[PDB]
Structures are given as C-alpha cells and as structure tokens.
C-alpha cells in the first residue's frame, strides 16, 4: 500500500510541510529538485512510510520498490521532470547529464496527476541487510527536465507529494525487535 514519504525531513520544515516538495520556476536550467536514498530501513524519508516500518521488524529484504509522484498545482501550470534511480558505485550524481545514464522516467504534467518510478532491484546477493558498505541500493534524484511554466495571475510555487511502496517480488527475512520503541519504566 502506497504511503507518504517525509522527503522534506529538514529542520526548517515542521508539521505537514515535511511531506511537500516545492516546485517553482527556475532560470538556470537543468536544475536539481530532490534526492534521497532508496534503503527502506535506513533513517530518512522512508522512516515515515508503512513499508519502512515493517522492514524495520526484519533483518533482510529483497525485491523491487515503487515511488509515485503526485503534482499539486493549478490546472494551468505545466512542466516536465526527470526521475532517476542510480545503482551504487559513486556519490550522488552532480548533473542531469550524469543522472540520466541510470534508470529514469521523464514525466510531464497533465490530466493524470501522478507518475510512477519502479526501482528494479539490481543487486548481487539475493537479499540485502537494513544496516546490520556491501548494501544500500543507490539513490533517487529528481531534476527539472524543462521548467515550471504558468500564465499571469497564478501562483509561482506548487508542491509534489511522494508515496512509496513495495512490489510483487518483495520479501523479508529473519524477524527481530524494532528500534523505534523506548522503555524507561512500567506504566506506558
């Protein structure tokens, strides 16, 4: 089941704004919007989703993942984005020319509001361990493909909501106690 990612997990954002990725008009071209790690049990955005919470109850995971992006703006605004998954091997890509060499989707705004990116499980072992170096699966990046274009008398800022989930081939291995509860006394 798809569930929202806390991609804006910074100090400035608090409350619901932690779930909104801002998108405005640029003037420097090929700019980067967002980036995050694709390990579901790692600390970060995935900590706010259901599949991440369940993966925190197990030691090893396998299979593909899915991230859906939903654009929220006026009917009149439009644009294009490049959503790129890059398998491990180097730091996060520094430009769209490097980022487009991996797996990616080009997404334009229209009647359909959302797009889907499938992270396809490119690994060497049949399983990966949720931070138990030889793991981590790569990085997802989101770049301006063309721009955010709007007519006059319309706000120049809009938002995008990301929603993460597992796939048909997903599976988990070795149950364990999670690390998101705390004990100090006996009444709670």
């Amino acid at each position: 089941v798809e569930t929202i990612l806390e991609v804006n997990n910074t100090t400035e954002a608090t409350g619901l704004t932690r779930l909104l990725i801002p998108v405005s008009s640029q003037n420097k071209a090929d700019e980067l919007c967002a980036a995050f790690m694709v390990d579901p049990g790692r600390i970060g955005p995935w900590q706010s989703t259901l599949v991440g919470q369940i993966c925190r109850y197990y030691t090893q995971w396998s299979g593909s993942l899915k991230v859906t992006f939903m654009f929220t703006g006026s009917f009149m605004a439009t644009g294009k984005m490049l959503v790129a998954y890059s398998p491990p091997g180097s730091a996060q890509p520094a430009n769209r020319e490097t980022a487009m060499l991996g797996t990616h989707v080009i997404w334009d705004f229209g009647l359909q509001s959302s797009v889907s990116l499938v992270i396809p499980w490119i690994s060497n072992t049949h399983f990966r361990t949720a931070k138990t170096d030889y793991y981590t699966a790569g990085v997802v990046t989101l770049w301006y493909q063309t721009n955010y274009v709007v007519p006059p008398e319309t706000p120049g800022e809009a938002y995008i909501i990301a929603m993460g989930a597992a796939q048909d081939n997903f599976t988990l291995k070795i149950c364990k106690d999670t690390d998101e509860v705390t004990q100090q006394a006996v009444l709670q």
Binding site: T10, G44, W46, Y58, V139, Q188
Partner: protein, 226 residues
C-alpha cells in the same frame, strides 16, 4: 526470473507467535500475597505490535518465571490462582479463597521450570479490540475529567493472584514475570504504527508540547545523509 525466495515468515501467525514480557508481579511475603490485573498494554514492545490492527482474535499461552531479589532459587511452594470477574479476591495468605474448588490454580516450586498454561479466547464479543470509540454507559459524560472514554468492557478478564503455600511468613521477596504468546491468530483493519512515545497504559495520550518527527532531520533536501 524464476524467483524462489520464500514468504511464509511474513504471515500474521509467525509474526505474533513468540513469547514476550507482559507482566511483572512483586511479592514481599513479609500481606503474604500479590495480585495483578490482567492487562497486556503495560510494555511497549508487544503493545506496538498488537496495535497495528483494530480487531484481533487469538488463543494464548502464559508462562510464569519467578525469582528472588538476589536471584536465588530456594525450594518453596507457590500457588498461582486465576480469579475471573465477579469471584472473590483473596484477602490473606490463609483465607478461604485459596482452597480453589472451581477456580483454576497451579502449584509450582521455585526450583521447577517456569510454569506454562494455555488460555482460550474469552471475550463476550467476537474479537478483542484495542480501540473502542465511545463510553460504556448512558449518562452525562462530563467535559473536564472524562475517563471511561476507552473502557471497552469486552476486554476485562479478571485478576491473577500469587501466594507462598506455607504455615507462616516465609520472609521471601519474590518477583514473577508473565510472558504471553499468541496462537491461532486472526486480525482485522490494519492501522498506522505508532510514532509518538507512550505515556499511559490504557489511553493513547501523547506529549503535544514535545512531538517527535517521524523521520530524522537532514541538512538539505538535495543531500542523501539522513
């Protein structure tokens, strides 16, 4: 790709069938008996797992592990009694309740392996539910000191009493830990898994002045550190 990975570990029964700490009862034997109200949302590890669903129906297995303050295991006899709702509660170490004639009981030594019994589904409703939105009474429901807003009277299952079977005071400080395992489980209506720290055993209260973020903060949205 002809995948053969295995998904049997992900079922509800295998997720819930493992003993976990449920209760701790302290006895002084200096009163001579101890009692415990059976309620299993006192420890957070099992509570978080059980509150991922709205309705849950299962049988249980209860294990009792009793020790002393220093940890010794001197040979004594203990009586474990289960007192269902309505039945009289024991009043002394020698009262007439301890001659259990209809109530179930287990006599066990401190030197014996931990005691283990089986318990069925005992609710007047069709399932145990951890979330009950309402009050168990027609009334006025005052707006200042409310309480009784999450009673769920379908979940009240009696008490557990423990005593030292002896002629007189044994001067033993005992501590018995109660571990519960769920068997033959069914569940309904999954819910979000709690992110806020627990504060009360029977209420879902959280500190509003101190809300914890569901994701750890990172420096910028353009990095991948946190």
């Amino acid at each position: 790709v002809v995948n053969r990975n295995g998904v049997l570990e992900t079922t509800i029964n295998h997720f819930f069938s493992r003993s976990g700490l449920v209760g701790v009862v302290n006895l002084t034997d200096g009163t001579g008996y101890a009692t415990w109200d059976i309620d299993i949302m006192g420890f957070v590890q099992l509570r978080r797992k059980c509150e991922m669903f709205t309705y849950m129906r299962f049988n249980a297995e209860f294990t009792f592990v009793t020790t002393t303050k220093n940890g010794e295991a001197r040979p004594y006899m203990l009586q474990y009694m289960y007192v269902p709702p309505g039945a009289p509660k024991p009043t002394g170490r020698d009262a007439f309740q301890w001659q259990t004639a209809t109530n179930p009981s287990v006599f066990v030594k401190l030197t014996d392996p931990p005691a283990q019994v089986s318990v069925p589904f005992m609710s007047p409703a069709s399932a145990y539910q951890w979330f009950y939105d309402g009050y168990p009474t027609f009334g006025q429901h005052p707006e200042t000191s409310n309480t009784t807003y999450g009673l769920c009277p379908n979940n009240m299952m009696g008490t557990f009493a423990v005593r030292v079977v002896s002629r007189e005071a044994s001067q033993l400080k005992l501590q018995t830990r109660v571990y519960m395992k769920l068997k033959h489980v069914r569940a309904w209506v999954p819910r979000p898994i709690r992110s806020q720290p627990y504060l009360l055993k029977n209420f879902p209260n959280y500190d509003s002045s101190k809300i914890t973020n569901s994701a750890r903060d990172r420096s910028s949205i353009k990095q991948a550190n946190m």
